[PDB]
Amino acid sequence: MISKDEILEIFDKYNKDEITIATLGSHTSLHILKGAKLEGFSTVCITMKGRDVPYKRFKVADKFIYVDNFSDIKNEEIQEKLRELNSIVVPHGSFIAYCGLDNVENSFLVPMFGNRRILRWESERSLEGKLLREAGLRVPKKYESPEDIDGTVIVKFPGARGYFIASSTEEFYKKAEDLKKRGILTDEDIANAHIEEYVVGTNFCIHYFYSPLKDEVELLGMDKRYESNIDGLVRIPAKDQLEMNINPSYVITGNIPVVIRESLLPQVFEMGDKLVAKAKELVPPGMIGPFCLQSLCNENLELVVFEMSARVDGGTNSFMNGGPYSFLYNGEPLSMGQRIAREIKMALQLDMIDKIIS
Amino acid sequence: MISKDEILEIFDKYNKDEITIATLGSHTSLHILKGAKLEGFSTVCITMKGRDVPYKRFKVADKFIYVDNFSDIKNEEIQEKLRELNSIVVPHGSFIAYCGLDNVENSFLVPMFGNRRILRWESERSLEGKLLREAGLRVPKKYESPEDIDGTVIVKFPGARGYFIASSTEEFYKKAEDLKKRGILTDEDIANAHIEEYVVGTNFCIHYFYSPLKDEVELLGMDKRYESNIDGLVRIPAKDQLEMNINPSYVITGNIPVVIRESLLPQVFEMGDKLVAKAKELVPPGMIGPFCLQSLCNENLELVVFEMSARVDGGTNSFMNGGPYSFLYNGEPLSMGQRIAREIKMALQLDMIDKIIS
Amino acid sequence: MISKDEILEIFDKYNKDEITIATLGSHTSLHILKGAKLEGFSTVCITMKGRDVPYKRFKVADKFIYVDNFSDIKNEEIQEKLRELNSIVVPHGSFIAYCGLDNVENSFLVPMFGNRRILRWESERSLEGKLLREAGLRVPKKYESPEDIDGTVIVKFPGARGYFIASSTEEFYKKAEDLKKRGILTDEDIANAHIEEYVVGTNFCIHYFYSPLKDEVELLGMDKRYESNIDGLVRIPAKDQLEMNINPSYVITGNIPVVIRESLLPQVFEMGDKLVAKAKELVPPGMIGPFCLQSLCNENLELVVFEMSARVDGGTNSFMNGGPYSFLYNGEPLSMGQRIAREIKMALQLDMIDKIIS
Amino acid sequence: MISKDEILEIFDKYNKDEITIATLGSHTSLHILKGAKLEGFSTVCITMKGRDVPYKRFKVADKFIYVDNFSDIKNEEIQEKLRELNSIVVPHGSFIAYCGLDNVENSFLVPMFGNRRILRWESERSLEGKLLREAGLRVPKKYESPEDIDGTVIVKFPGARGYFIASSTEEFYKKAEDLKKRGILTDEDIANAHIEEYVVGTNFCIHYFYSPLKDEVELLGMDKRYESNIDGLVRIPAKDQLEMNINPSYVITGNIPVVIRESLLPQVFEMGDKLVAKAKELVPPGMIGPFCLQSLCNENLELVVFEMSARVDGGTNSFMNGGPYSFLYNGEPLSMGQRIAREIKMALQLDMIDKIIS
Ligand SMILES: Nc1ncnc2c1ncn2[C@@H]1O[C@H](COP(=O)(O)OP(=O)(O)CP(=O)(O)O)[C@@H](O)[C@H]1O
Ligand SMILES: Nc1ncnc2c1ncn2[C@@H]1O[C@H](COP(=O)(O)OP(=O)(O)CP(=O)(O)O)[C@@H](O)[C@H]1O
Ligand SMILES: Nc1ncnc2c1ncn2[C@@H]1O[C@H](COP(=O)(O)OP(=O)(O)CP(=O)(O)O)[C@@H](O)[C@H]1O
Ligand SMILES: Nc1ncnc2c1ncn2[C@@H]1O[C@H](COP(=O)(O)OP(=O)(O)CP(=O)(O)O)[C@@H](O)[C@H]1O
Ligand SMILES: NC(=O)c1ncn([C@@H]2O[C@H](COP(=O)(O)O)[C@@H](O)[C@H]2O)c1N
Ligand SMILES: NC(=O)c1ncn([C@@H]2O[C@H](COP(=O)(O)O)[C@@H](O)[C@H]2O)c1N
Ligand SMILES: NC(=O)c1ncn([C@@H]2O[C@H](COP(=O)(O)O)[C@@H](O)[C@H]2O)c1N
Ligand SMILES: NC(=O)c1ncn([C@@H]2O[C@H](COP(=O)(O)O)[C@@H](O)[C@H]2O)c1N
Ligand SMILES: [Cl-]
Ligand SMILES: [Cl-]
Ligand SMILES: [Cl-]
Ligand SMILES: [Cl-]
Ligand SMILES: [Cl-]
Ligand SMILES: [Cl-]
Ligand SMILES: [Cl-]
Ligand SMILES: [Cl-]
């Protein structure tokens, strides 16, 4: 389990005049890297043949560390190149996945922006729910078993895409079976089934930034998810949908910008404030930098959080050129990637790097 | 009924070197206030405990006038603080509502950007329709009674959310009853029922600005509404929707940016030109500053206006950092809030304040 | 058939110090013209009474060539005004249509940005499919006859809006007949019927720019289409849709910005690279400047191209003030219109005009 | 004598995705490095303890190559670090001096922006005069010996500061002797004495840029020299100067911005055009990038060139934030350093690196 001192004392051997920002070339790296450049940093992008073109043509990376496959980023060899470049790593979804979250927590000896420990509170549904519940945030009702279904529910399986909607116990088994005989779910997944209230409302994935330097939760932007096949499915007229044998899937393919009704911003900020206050208690020092509440706004104007991330969320890509909210601070086209880099910049200049790395 | 002279002569006692822009902290105030700052104004934000965080963290307000509840903004005490700060008030939805439109028309003795009189032509469906019809704009067919229904209609009740769709007289009563026994509509609302043609098409809420200084209608931007539960409802596959007992509601929760097919801009501009030419005749001096046509584009490329506002519409929040249309004028990230402030700026500099306040 | 030399030698008689950019006032002209101005060009806009207001109020045109009807832009009289203004014409959908594609290929003697020959590879479904197939891009399955239908298909008629969805041979004829007796399709259209796999997924219209100066395919932005009545139709709850007798139409009314999942950008770039490499072989010099792949992302994260353009696509209007992708290059609000003008600028400065005009 | 192929083939082994700009930390490096960063390059600054603070605090250097003394920059060890960083070196006064011009011409195996050969045409008074005379530029009259003095002359010695003014042969020896007995000049310097017409007029050091990509001479800015003790000496009232025993020295200490009378710009441009046309003939490929004519404007509005440089002149420091002339191109705060970096940028993108390096 990587210690702080184990990290601070690695950063102490860094050339503090040549500190770079590094990340894996995927997920949200385009504005992580662009944002870094805009803040005056030189940037390092871990990449591989076949997947490096976007980073070359957008010209956001000063140095490339090529790997055979992204799984190699855990390798001690890459950790060394990174340390020799004085890189502070900015973590994201793809990086945690390809590196392996366990390798991240105790085998990845490179300074990393954010709270290293809290990355597993986002990966485990039990910890997430604990956090969200204890922070006092609205979540969907959970159902222990298919027999408890008394309304419309969504059912999630960590399997192969692993989703269906049900309005009764009977329907639950009809659909589970369908997906089983169709070769998408095994009985192991069917037992793992997570059943929750289906919330009917508008999607707001809210992107926050907690600055430990300023001790302030900031609102940076919002997106709604664009998912396949579901957003294609519901674009088929009902009469034709009824003639089809098609199951909804919810694969993230993209994002669409959205802004919320302004009278709801006090709720939005309170939600971020609460998450932050509680996460300080449960996982010190708490949330560091970017975090996302993925919510649904019901007809009673209550935001229900069905998901959260403890680092930068893919939806930040929707405002790489700045957004309506990020503009208000200083009238600039500020991305989340640039807001991260600036926190790193300040921290270095104020000699408070210990507030933002681990 | 607040006179012009009653207002001009209050503005004459203003320190013309220290003129501020004020508004209530809600609805569209973020870019009203940010836009003001960007134009060099000091800004005043009426706010209250529990609802002030967004305005503090986005740093758009130089001075805060705190109230116990937003209903107090009609109070003579707040009118005085505002007058002592040399504030020109920028009105919007939440402000007119919390102040009370009657208090606005004859009890609110603070200079106000726009045409004070015309604020009630947006609040009364009879005046709106009169205006839109007389301006020569396409509107949905109206139906006098449930018995006149010969197609799909939408039905609106000023009640508690108060909407349903019907394709027959019989269906109208089936649904009215459902909502009655469900405790959403009383027979008073059911009689008040407004029935109109359901227009099937794409939503464009078009944001215009009429400059009385330039005598020109400008196009600033467009959004589509993001409403709950309807936009959540239609995201459920048809087969599952049929298994649910759920009524559509249309609560505004947010906005999504959109641009229109360019060949349709002459229609768009003609619509704004017509609204303006007629409103000059019907309510002198007519439209002043921001106004919105909320339209649906049918398959015949005709924009049908189902609603309008005579001040700044919430949808302007979608381009607080500028939009595709607002950019064209000077290549700037121009919000509606900033366009309002600039009109105020010019007016002061050209000594033509009488063209924009009342 | 307009020769290159026939064009180069017309451009040689041009005052190379006074080169302007011209286009017809429609489709995408707002940012074509604005982009030109931003790059230092004087701009020419072909327009007509009743349709000139947007170009006057947005102030993007320095000179107006008025016509009686846009059909007159083929007239030798307009070709001369254009040549006397040293105009390089930027072609787009509306221009090719109003001028007539045949008049464009051999009767329009004005220098034109792009590959003149390739404009008809976008107009003919046989050439398009050839190109896309030979480039190795995923396309929807084609069906030779209604009898071959073994899934859900979409059916396209070049007629009056000319679309329907079918899941069986029987349904195909039920619907064809409906549209026939309804006066939308004649038996000539019904024979012309193009049947293809209905792809269920998320719409990404991807806007690329191939720079022959840099020999590089660039990603500029993405939109999703906003079509009527379909996007209005599917916003009606299923229960109400079933009570209606309504056919879906797919008239382009507007666009909504979207960004793609970042891990998919290597696929996105590969697709543009492949299209470009093949079009060089099939229609020398190949793609010049703006081109669009109109795709659907299925649940397997495969982009299926159902359409393409070989010039600037209307969807570029969604980022006239720049977009998340166009920002990354130099942190600027770069439109496609401005990217076109810059290529023209460079070409002139480097004396490589022969790489971009025809 | 470093060959082109010897350099091109070293640059061919460069990672063309990671090309940096390098220079020695002095002379004009601040805007060479800042300009590079602004164009998207990562920057390398050769520096040493005691002289690195300005480059650290202005944050213009991403990587530092420390040396013991600047004389070490000729060392094969530094040439290697530079080659491993894919650095293109931007040469300037201090760099040529500390490296040694002979080491530069045939011992410095790093790609270098500009025409390597022509660096010695600026170092030798005979070549300079040849060039300037053959280009057809006005220069001060030369005098072969003190006996030829028939007016006011300035006398230059390459010695220890080594200057005096004389109006007669007698005065020449009076002053030479004074400086000899004072320990500033030895008889070797006194024989080396260069005597030329003293031009009475206004100093314009004109900074040009020849773009081989565009084949165009550009005007970037102008400064006047600020020299000690002379500019301090002449600030003493005449009556007091006569009471002092003080000799004028002309040590460059700084620069002051100046703009020229606009009617003189055709002369200014013609001078740069002529220098460039001739230097192409005399030293192929001629002038590459920045060059300076150091001139005096006599009362007849004729610019007399008393000096020139074939690379970037220290006076460019006066417009590191852009100047009145550099602004006109694109309304940007363009330094010479940034104009150099942009030429490098373009060259790489257009695959024309062979036009700018040697
Ligand atoms: N309680 C709920 N009610 C209604 N819809 C829900 C829901 N929970 C999830 N969804 C829909 O299903 C999608 C997938 O939800 P999930 O909880 O799997 O998010 P996620 O972000 O963890 C999946 P991934 O990480 O693969 O993007 C959501 O984006 C949302 O559109
Ligand atoms: N004639 C019509 N046809 C189809 N849809 C309609 C319609 N009139 C309204 N709608 C839908 O119902 C929603 C509510 O319409 P309404 O006329 O109540 O607008 P509004 O702006 O006055 C309500 P609020 O002020 O609460 O936002 C609209 O945003 C639109 O989506
Ligand atoms: N294979 C397919 N599967 C699913 N939907 C499809 C499809 N092909 C087309 N569509 C839908 O139908 C619309 C019209 O498609 P079409 O192929 O006519 O594009 P287009 O751009 O040539 C028509 P226009 O030129 O008039 O805009 C598309 O925008 C898409 O929404
Ligand atoms: N012919 C002339 N008439 C009048 N003044 C002259 C002159 N030649 C030079 N000077 C003055 O003497 C100064 C030094 O001139 P010099 O010819 O040594 O330039 P330089 O740039 O080669 C010296 P350094 O390289 O040390 O700056 C000039 O900057 C100018 O002010
Ligand atoms: N664009 C997005 O919203 C997004 N993109 C990726 N992700 C999440 O990040 C994870 C890794 O992304 P990728 O599979 O593209 O490498 C995915 O499993 C997904 O949960 C997102 N939420
Ligand atoms: N974001 C919006 O479009 C929006 N936000 C608010 N409004 C209108 O302004 C009125 C007051 O807003 P609020 O209820 O958020 O204080 C609301 O009733 C609604 O009609 C909107 N149209
Ligand atoms: N906004 C758009 O996407 C768009 N606007 C126009 N078009 C295409 O250009 C053609 C010409 O446009 P217009 O009919 O607006 O003159 C249309 O038939 C359509 O295919 C588009 N794709
Ligand atoms: N600021 C200037 O004009 C300037 N600074 C330096 N130089 C020239 O560059 C040569 C090297 O500069 P330095 O001595 O500062 O290292 C000096 O001998 C001088 O001729 C200048 N012309
Ligand atoms: Cl985030
Ligand atoms: Cl994510
Ligand atoms: Cl508005
Ligand atoms: Cl509103
Ligand atoms: Cl395009
Ligand atoms: Cl198009
Ligand atoms: Cl120079
Ligand atoms: Cl110099």
Side-chain angles (χ1 to χ4, degrees), chain A residues 230-267:
Chain A
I230 184 60
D231 289 316
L233 179 43
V234 301
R235 212 219 179 204
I236 297 167
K239 283 159 186 279
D240 303 298
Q241 279 186 58
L242 300 190
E243 282 174 300
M244 307 169 68
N245 303 312
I246 186 174
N247 303 131
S249 47
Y250 297 80
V251 189
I252 185 65
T253 70
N255 320 255
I256 298 167
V258 69
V259 295
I260 207 169
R261 182 179 182 161
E262 194 180 294
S263 62
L264 294 179
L265 286 174
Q267 185 184 157

Side-chain angles (χ1 to χ4, degrees), chain D residues 27 93 225 294 309 311-315:
Chain D
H27 192 262
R225 300 292 202 237
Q294 301 155 245
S309 72
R311 33 72 186 184
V312 62
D313 177 277

Side-chain angles (χ1 to χ4, degrees), chain B residues 247-262:
Chain B
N247 303 131
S249 47
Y250 297 80
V251 189
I252 185 65
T253 70
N255 320 255
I256 298 167
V258 69
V259 295
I260 207 169
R261 182 179 182 161
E262 194 180 294

Side-chain angles (χ1 to χ4, degrees), chain A residues 126-139 278:
Chain A
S126 40
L127 294 177
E128 269 210 33
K130 181 170 167 49
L131 180 36
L132 296 166
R133 161 178 57 88
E134 295 197 50
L137 297 185
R138 292 185 182 100
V139 286
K278 183 59 61 189

Side-chain angles (χ1 to χ4, degrees), chain C residues 27 93 225 309 311-315:
Chain C
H27 192 262
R225 300 292 202 237
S309 72
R311 32 72 186 184
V312 62
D313 177 277

Side-chain angles (χ1 to χ4, degrees), chain C residues 12 14 21 59 69 119 159 180 184 206 256 266 282-283 315 349:
Chain C
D12 285 343
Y14 268 18
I21 289 176
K59 310 217 96 289
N69 302 294
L119 291 186
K180 178 171 170 287
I184 295 166
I206 303 159
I256 298 167
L282 305 186
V283 214
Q349 292 180 351

